[PDB]
Amino acid sequence: KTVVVTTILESPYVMMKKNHEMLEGNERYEGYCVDLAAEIAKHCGFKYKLTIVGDGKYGARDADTKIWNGMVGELVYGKADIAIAPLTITLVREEVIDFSKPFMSLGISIMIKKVSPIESAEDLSKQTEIAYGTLDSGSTKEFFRRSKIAVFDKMWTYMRSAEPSVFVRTTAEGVARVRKSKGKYAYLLESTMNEYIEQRKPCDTMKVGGNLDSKGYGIATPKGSSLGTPVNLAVLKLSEQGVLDKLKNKWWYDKGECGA
Amino acid sequence: KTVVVTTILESPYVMMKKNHEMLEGNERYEGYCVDLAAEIAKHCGFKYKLTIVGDGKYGARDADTKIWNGMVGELVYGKADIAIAPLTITLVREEVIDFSKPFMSLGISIMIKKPQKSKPLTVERMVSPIESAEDLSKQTEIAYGTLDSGSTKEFFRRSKIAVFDKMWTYMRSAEPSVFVRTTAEGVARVRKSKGKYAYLLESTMNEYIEQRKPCDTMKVGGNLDSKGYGIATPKGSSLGTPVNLAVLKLSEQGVLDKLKNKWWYDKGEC
Amino acid sequence: KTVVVTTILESPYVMMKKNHEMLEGNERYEGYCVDLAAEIAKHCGFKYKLTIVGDGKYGARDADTKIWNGMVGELVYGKADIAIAPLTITLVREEVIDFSKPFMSLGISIMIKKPQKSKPLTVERMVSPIESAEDLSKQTEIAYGTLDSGSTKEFFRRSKIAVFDKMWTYMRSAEPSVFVRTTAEGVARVRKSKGKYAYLLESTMNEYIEQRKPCDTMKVGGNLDSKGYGIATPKGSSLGTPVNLAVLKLSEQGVLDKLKNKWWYDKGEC
Amino acid sequence: KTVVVTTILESPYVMMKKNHEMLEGNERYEGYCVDLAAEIAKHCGFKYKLTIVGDGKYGARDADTKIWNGMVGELVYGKADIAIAPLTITLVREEVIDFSKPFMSLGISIMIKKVSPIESAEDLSKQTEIAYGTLDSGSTKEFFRRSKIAVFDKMWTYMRSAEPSVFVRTTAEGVARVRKSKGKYAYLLESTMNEYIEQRKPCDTMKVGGNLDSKGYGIATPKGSSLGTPVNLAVLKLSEQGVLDKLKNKWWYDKGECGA
Ligand SMILES: NS(=O)(=O)c1cc2c(cc1Cl)N[C@H]([C@H]1C[C@H]3C=C[C@@H]1C3)NS2(=O)=O
Ligand SMILES: NS(=O)(=O)c1cc2c(cc1Cl)N[C@H]([C@H]1C[C@H]3C=C[C@@H]1C3)NS2(=O)=O
Ligand SMILES: NS(=O)(=O)c1cc2c(cc1Cl)N[C@H]([C@H]1C[C@H]3C=C[C@@H]1C3)NS2(=O)=O
Ligand SMILES: NS(=O)(=O)c1cc2c(cc1Cl)N[C@H]([C@H]1C[C@H]3C=C[C@@H]1C3)NS2(=O)=O
Ligand SMILES: N[C@@H](CCC(=O)O)C(=O)O
Ligand SMILES: N[C@@H](CCC(=O)O)C(=O)O
Ligand SMILES: N[C@@H](CCC(=O)O)C(=O)O
Ligand SMILES: N[C@@H](CCC(=O)O)C(=O)O
């Protein structure tokens, strides 16, 4: 009985190698999440199959319908057994799926094309000359929707009432938008992906400010599943012997195809 | 019914008030941990009384007769219901108790007494004889110590990394023992050692001591490992889900961030 | 029963929202004044309807055919119940309506176009032809005027001081139509006058226009006097005491200061 | 029937004349408040007698007793008819006495001896080596006690718990304590008296930071008294014709025994 694993096409977590057209099975995928899934299977001792989520959405619940899309929907509705992917641990998602202990710390950061006048987030909210956006159906957008800090509510009020839409469909599309905006558009994304982008050639984007908050990535399992304890123990073990640190160093700093 | 909550006197997590001789109940203690417990009670209503573990240890797997001591030992054997205190999440601990989601990020850091400023146009510069863990392990002129019955000692004991293994090998044979009973003893040793002692401790406490007078000690390098603090609860308890949900609610509400800002950086004496 | 609340369209006190076409009720208007009305309704429970007076005037009294116009006229003759708007407290108005305690300080000032940077070691300095009110009265190469049917004209008309009386005499002697119907018209006259006109207005609006693009005007000198903005109710009304108490409570609670900061200094530029 | 006017001994509002031993009656008093009372009587048309408050307190309500002392006590208990004195208009005082329109704006300031490390109030609250105190039985003390702002709350916690008594009995005692503390003490007092002190020789004190809030001095009358409207319109008249400004300039800047 193989285990269906739901992932997303996001770098450096999952890459579609370079010759996927002439490869079969999981051998056509590479990345941090593929290595993490391999280690999880090695510790637990189960066969796994890598399946991409049908819709390129991390997961959210749409109001007035009460339905889930993406990996979270693929988990609550029994379409997959485990989600080794950069899924943010949030209060809403925990009520419907089980989150393991975080395996990668993260924070909300602001990145712009290459002293930067943006500086911190409050100045970005005050300065309306330069626009800022957020990935569609992500934890950042839901974080800003339910935020209560006055500055964060100002940012949310600006984003929900803007023309055209400041939101972006995919992270790569947001990177392209910020690169092609000549410093007129800003992107709010996770610290890990932003760092990976800023350490990659041509290196036309940089991180500004600090981290708005602190979150984490966890291995997701369906509610009431028997895999929660083994995957939690495996994540704890990997953190104890630093396999996660080695994987992050390999996939974030070993290549270093940038000037730094 | 009022449950038993256990804490340990570590500043700024749990500190005794100046006017505490006559006060009774939960009003005796003040700190970050008591505020976290108050917010936990506000989210899910329950009655709690602040207690301190008898031997004042975080909890370690004692060898030989296989006995758990300190906070974890109290939690396991039914004398405790929940521990709201800076207890790091550990695989060994996770196999023995249940841990909530990390409410505080942490890492192993290195402490050293701040050297005197170098005189050499006329600008003044600081020279750090210690920079990283590899250089600290390579040298022998400066001894280094850890906390007795602490998760840092467990991490060093079974670390496959060559530098960490060499460090632990030095620790086990070093005489007199560099291990200290309380973090206060370690900070005192660092202060009185004239710079000949490096006491490894969690990044949060190191930053707290740095921000506070007499601010004669400094934190060197980056975090060797990345870990977190979790609210402990005995296995097979119905209270784990409410505390996990309350921690998630507090983290998403920004209460934890403002509490950390007000307890670690608002009281900056240097 | 819903009472009538009359206001005046002055930024940032009362400005229509961009998407006001497809909205009805009080949701169309936004600014400092609507927030003050919301706090007033929160303190004392009542329903209010936001209305704009037909002639769009603050209030003045004719001498030959005595009649009160604008907001004060609306309040006196029973057409309105309360005016939560920047109405200056005046002795003449106090004899025809009831003013609560002031909720914002103010002062008569002078507006002038911002001069160009002076190139002539290499520094840039701001030099203005006007330094205070006395020089403006003494000089005759820059014309000045106030707002039509307002409190500033009333103050200048019956001022015994030599400088202000002389200014009023020139206001009757220059003989253009130096009095402007709206504050926006006077600001536009100052901006497009290339440096030939000075506008007298309240310090609050002066600062608001100063901190907003294209910011081609400066605040010169200091306030010629001190006045305030009060919530006005008709004489003999039972609502004067509740609104007075609500304003006092808001002032003690710091809500007024936070609204002033968020509507005057948190939206600035250049 | 002469009208009893309750005043307090506080400069420059009311000064006890140096020749008062040979001066009998209302002639023995001079100051801003004496001139204001003279103008009020000139407008309204009543005979006035200035009587100092028995106990040098502006006014407050005792906790667990519910009694009023000082000017407010002298007003609500029928001891005096009008209070022409620097009485701060506050929320709780208005419920028991009638306040007129303010005749002088004011704010909460900071007093220290002559780099200015303290600067603003938040930095004053951050630092502990230097202590700050206010005057008991006054608007500032009640405002600090009843303030709900976190920074003001921590200031109140500091002053309410300090040994010895950080509070002061009189404004002159406060400025003397500031002068003799060699910069180790801070006084939070009304901005008007702060300016008067800082412009008076030997000029060893100066104002730092900005005003924490905005209040006003008003003429006080007993609840239900008939003097409300006459004194209110008199204050409005005086403020409109600038006599109030002239008196302020005379009693604060005309002498100028300092260099500025
Ligand atoms: N350095 S990092 O961001 O790749 C990173 C971040 C984290 C790691 C491990 C690594 Cl390598 N483990 C912790 C978990 C492990 C065990 C101890 C704390 C939680 C449970 N979560 S974390 O603090 O989010
Ligand atoms: N800034 S901090 O170290 O006090 C801190 C650290 C952390 C916080 C919140 C704060 Cl304020 N919440 C996260 C939690 C939120 C959700 C994602 C990871 C856990 C579950 N853990 S954390 O990354 O260990
Ligand atoms: N800073 S400001 O001009 O917006 C401002 C000005 C004033 C405020 C409050 C604010 Cl926020 N309250 C006072 C009121 C409070 C009590 C004392 C005077 C009146 C009654 N009036 S004020 O001195 O005219
Ligand atoms: N220049 S000053 O501080 O002596 C001063 C301050 C003030 C004065 C008059 C003077 Cl001279 N009058 C106003 C009053 C007049 C009318 C408008 C606001 C109140 C009612 N209060 S005030 O803004 O507190
Ligand atoms: N990976 C995040 C989305 C990234 C973002 O917030 O922009 C999530 O699973 O919610
Ligand atoms: N926080 C650690 C103790 C500190 C240390 O070991 O350095 C624990 O809970 O075990
Ligand atoms: N605020 C003034 C009008 C503005 C002005 O005259 O400059 C009033 O209420 O009369
Ligand atoms: N004059 C003030 C007291 C001065 C102070 O606040 O220190 C009052 O009447 O309340």
Q: In D, which residues are within 8 Å of B268 by CB distance? A: 126
What one-letter code names the amino acid at A97?
I
Q: Is the dihedral of CA A133, A136, A139, A141 positive or negative?
A: positive
C55 shares contact with chain A (CB less than 8 Å): no
Where chain C is discontinuous (C–N > 2.5 Å), the residues before each break are 120
Element containing residue B232 per DSSP (H, E) = strand B232-233
Q: D140: annotated binding-site residue?
A: yes
Which of 16-45 (C) contact A at CB < 8 A? 19
d(CA B192, CA C203): 61
Helix axes C240-253, C255-264, angle to 10 degrees: 70
Residues in a beta bridge with B49: B4
8 A C-beta contact, residue C208 and residue C104? no
Distance CA C186, CA C197 (A): 9
Token pair of B71, please? 């906070």
Work out the number of other CB atoms within 10 angstroms of the CB of residue A60.
22
Q: Domains, chain C, ranges and CATH?
A: 2-104+228-264 (3.40.190.10), 108-220 (3.40.190.10)
CA distances, D257 to each of C227, D199, D260 (Å) = 29, 7, 10
Of the candidates B39, B20, B18, the one whose C-alpha atom is nearest the C-alpha of residue B246 is B39
D215 lines ligand 3 (CB under 6 A): yes
Q: How far is CA A235 from CA A105, B99, D211, in A?
A: 13, 14, 55
Q: Is C in contact with B (3 or more beta carbon pairs below 8 Å)?
A: no
Give the distance from CA A235 to its chain's centroid. Answer: 18
How far, in Å, CA of D109 to CA of D191, rounded? 5
Angle at A42 between CA A39 and CA A46, to 5 degrees: 120
Run of H or E residues at D7: strand D3-7
Question: Could you give the angle at which helices C32-43 and C240-253 cross, rounded to 10 degrees?
Answer: 110
| D103 lies within 8 A of chain C by CB | no
Classify residue B221 by its DSSP letter: S
Burial class of residue B231 in the structure, from the number of CB atoms within 10 Å of its CB (0-12 exposed, 13-18 middle, 19+ buried): buried
Structure tokens that stand for D255 in this block: 């002498």
**What chains are in contact with D, requiring at least 3 Cβ pairs below 8 Å?**
B, C
Q: How far is C31 from C12, CA to CA, in rounded Å?
A: 5
Burial of D70 (0-12, 13-18, 19+ CB in 10 A): buried
Q: Which token pair is B61?
A: 């797997």
Q: Judge if the beta carbon of residue C86 lies within 6 A of ligand 7.
A: yes
Residue type (1 letter), B236: G
Single-letter code of the amino acid located at C138 = K
In angstroms, the CA C40 to CA C35 distance is 9
Interface check for C257 against chain D (CB to CB < 8 A): the answer is: yes
Report residue D182: phi and psi, to 5°.
Answer: 55, 45
Q: Which residue, A64, A73, A14, A11, is CA-closest to A38?
A: A14
Residues of D in contact with C161 (CB under 8 A): 242
The DSSP element (H or E) to which D122 belongs, if any, is helix D121-126
Ligand 1 midpoint to CA C244 (Å): 57
The secondary element (H helix, E strand) that includes residue B111 is: strand B108-113
Side chain identity at B103, as an amino acid letter?
Answer: F
Closest-CA residue, ligand 2 atom 13, reads A215
DSSP B180: B
- PDB resolution in Å: 3.3
Enumerate the β-bridge partners of residue B217.
B113
Contacts of D258 (CB under 8 A, 6+ apart): D199, D200, D201, D203
Distance between CA atoms of residues B152 and C242, nearest Å:
63
**Residues in contact with C221: Cβ distance below 8 Å, sequence separation at least 6, in sequence order:** C109, C110, C130, C131, C132, C133
Bridge pairing between strands B197-202 and B143-145: parallel
Please identify, by atom number, the ligand 6 atom nearest to the C-alpha of residue B71: 9
Q: Please, are residues C112 and C263 in contact by the beta-carbon 8 Å criterion? A: no
Residue by residue, DSSP assigns chain A as --EEEEE---TTT-B-TTTGGG--GGGG-BSHHHHHHHHHHHHHT--EEEEE-SSS---EEETTTTEEETHHHHHHTTS-SBB-S-PBP-HHHHTTEEE-S-SEEE-EEEEEE---TT-SHHHHHH--SSEEEEBTTSHHHHHHHH--SHHHHHHHHHHHS-SS---BSSHHHHHHHHHHTTTSEEEEEEHHHHHHHHTSTT--EEEES--S--EEE--EEETT-TTHHHHHHHHHHHHHTTHHHHHHHIIIIIS--S--
Q: Which residues of A touch C19 (CB under 8 A)?
A: 161
Angstrom distance (rounded) from CA D110 to CA D205 = 10
Given a contact cutoff of 8 angstroms between Cβ atoms, the answer to whether A4 and A53 are in contact is no
Residue B76 Cα to ligand 6 midpoint, Å, equals 18
The string of DSSP codes covering D137-197 is SSHHHHHHHH--SHHHHHHHHHHHS-SS---BSSHHHHHHHHHHTTTSEEE--BHHHHHHH
| Contact yes or no for A106/A94 (Cβ under 8 A) | no
In contact, B169 and B105? CB cutoff 8 Å: no
Are the Cβ atoms of B268 and D126 closer than 8 angstroms? Answer: yes
d(CA C227, CA C87): 10
Atom of ligand 3 nearest to the CA of C252: 15
User: Of all atoms in ligand 5, which is nearest to the CA of residue A10?
Assistant: 1
Alpha carbon distance B160, C176 (integer Å):
91
> How many Cα atoms sit within 13 Å of D145 on the Cβ side?
14
Give CA A189 to chain center in angstroms: 8
Reduce the DSSP state of residue B24 to 3 states and report it: coil
Whether C86 contacts C33, CB under 8 Å? yes
Ligand 4 proximal residues by C-beta, below 6 Å: C 89, 102, 105, 226-228; D 101-105, 216, 236, 239, 244-245, 248
Amino acid at D74: E
In chain B, which residues have their Cβ closer than 8 Å to the Cβ of D126? 266, 268
Task: Give the distance (Å) from ligand 2 centre to CA of residue A213.
Answer: 8
A140 Cα–ligand 1 center, Å:
20
| Cα→Cα distances D68→C15, D79, D137, Å | 46, 12, 10
DSSP D49-107: EEEE-SSS--EEE-TTT--EEHHHHHHHTTS-SBB-S-PBP-HHHHTTEEE-S-SEEE-
Contacts C214 to A, Cβ<8 Å = none
CA angle A206–A210–A211, rounded 5-degree value: 110
Rounded to an integer, what distance in angstroms lies between the CA atom of residue D213 and that of residue B223? 45
| Residue D240 annotated as lining a ligand binding site | no
Q: Any known ligand binding at C93?
A: yes
Ligand 2, atom 17: nearest CA belongs to which residue?
A: A215
The Cα D258–Cα D260 span in angstroms is 7
Given CB atoms, is B214 within the 8 Å cutoff of chain D?
no
The C-alpha R_g of chain C, in whole angstroms, comes to 20
**Does the beta carbon of B257 lie under 8 angstroms from any beta carbon of chain A?**
yes
| Residue D232 token pair | 């209110």
Q: Is there a contact between C112 and C194 (Cβ–Cβ < 8 Å)? A: no
| Contact status, residue B99 vs residue B93, Cβ threshold 8 Å | yes
CA–CA separation, D216 vs D103, rounded Å? 7
B269 to chain D, any CB pair closer than 8 A? The answer is yes
Q: What angle do CA D248, D250, D255 make, to 5 degrees?
A: 130
Judged by a CB distance cut-off of 8 A, whether residue D210 touches chain C is no
Tell me the best of D139, D192, D215 to mutate to test the pocket of ligand 3, counting ligand atoms within 8 Å of each CB and taking the most: D215
Q: Whose CA is nearest to atom 6 of ligand 6?
A: B150
Nearest ligand (C-alpha, residue D237): 4
Ligand 1 binding pocket, CB closer than 6 Å: A 101-105, 216, 236, 239, 244-245, 248; B 89, 102, 105, 226-228
Q: Which amino acid is at D219?
A: I
Q: Does B117 touch chain A (CB under 8 A)?
A: no
CA D111 – CA D195 distance, rounded (Å): 10
Are A36 and A103 spatial neighbours (Cβ–Cβ below 8 Å)?
yes
Residue ranges of alpha helices (H) inside B18-173 are 32-43, 70-76, 91-94, 133-138, 151-157, 162-173
Mutation to test the A interface, candidates B164, B165, B226, B249, most A Cβ within 10 Å: B226
The full DSSP string for chain C is -EEEEEE---TTTSEE-TT-TT--GGGGEESHHHHHHHHHHHHS--EEEEEE-TT-----B-SSS--B-HHHHHHHTTS-SBB-S-PBP-HHHHTTSEE---SEEE-EEEEEEPPPPB------B---S-SSHHHHHH--SSEEE-BTTSHHHHHHHT--SHHHHHHHHHHTTS-S--SBSSHHHHHHHHHHTSS-EEEEEEHHHHHHHHTSTT--EEEES--SS-EEE--EE-TT-TTHHHHHHHHHHHHHHTHHHHHHHHHHTSS---
- Counting from 1 in the atom list of ligand 7, the atom nearest the Cα of C151 is 10
| Contact by Cβ (8 Å): D99, C248 | no
Q: Are C237 and C147 in contact (CB under 8 A)?
A: no
Please report which helix (H) or strand (E) contains residue D16, including its range: strand D15-16
Query: What Å distances lie between residue B2 and A40, B31, B48, B49, C38, CA to CA?
Result: 40, 21, 5, 7, 43
How many A from CA of C255 to the centre of ligand 7?
24
Residues of B in contact with A93 (CB under 8 A): none
Closest residue CA from atom 3 of ligand 5: A138
Characterise A95 by phi-psi region: left (phi > 0), alpha (psi -120 to 50), beta (else): alpha
Determine whether the annotation assigns residue C11 to a binding site. no
Helices B32-43/B240-253 angle, 10° precision: 110
Distance in angstroms (rounded) separating the CA atoms of residues A199 and D86 = 65
Nearest chain C residue to D217, by CA = C101
Nearest CA in chain A to B96: A233
The dihedrals phi and psi of B213, each to the nearest 5 degrees, come to: -65, 155
**H/E element, B99:** strand B98-99
Q: Which atom of ligand 3 is nearest to the CA of D99?
A: 20
State the burial class of residue B33 (Cβ atoms within 10 Å of its Cβ: 0-12, 13-18, 19+).
buried
Read off the tokens for B78: 């039914």
CB A120 less than 6 A from any atom of ligand 2: no
Q: Which residues of B touch D161 (CB under 8 A)?
A: 19
Count of CB pairs separated by less than 8 Å, C with D: 60
The verdict on C244 touching D (C-beta cutoff 8 Å) is: yes
Counting ligands in written order, which one lies closest to the CA of residue B88? Answer: 6
- Kindly give the number of the ligand 7 atom that is closest to the alpha carbon of C106: 1
Tokens at D123, concatenated: 């930095």
Question: What was the experiment behind these coordinates?
Answer: cryo-EM
Pocket test for ligand 8, best of D88, D89, D94, D147 (most atoms within 8 A of CB): D88
Give dist(CA D177, CA D173) in Å, integer. Answer: 6
What is the CA angle C38-C41-C42, rounded to 5?
85
Of the candidates D81, D72, D97, D100, the one whose C-alpha atom is nearest the C-alpha of residue D3 is D81
Query: Angle at Cα A225 formed by Cα A221 and Cα A229, nearest 5°?
Result: 80
DSSP character at residue B224: S
What is the C-alpha separation between C34 and A183, in angstroms, rounded? 36
* Distance of alpha carbon B215 from alpha carbon D18, whole angstroms: 55
Sign for the CA dihedral angle at C79, C82, C86, C88 comes to: positive
Orientation of helix C255-264 relative to helix C203-210, angle to 10°? 40
Say how many residues make up chain D. Answer: 260
Distance between CA atoms of residues A227 and A3, nearest Å: 11
C-alpha to C-alpha distance for D169 and D155, rounded to whole angstroms: 19
CB of A148 within 8 Å of a chain B CB? The answer is yes
- Is residue B182 a contact partner of residue B169, using CB atoms and an 8 Å limit? no
- D93 in a labelled binding site: yes
CA distance A58 to A73: 9
DSSP-based three-state secondary structure for B134: helix
C226-251 in b/e form (b: 16+ CB < 10 A) is: bbbbbbbbbeebebbebbbbbbbebb
Q: Would the CA dihedral through D175, D177, D181, D187 be positive or negative?
A: negative
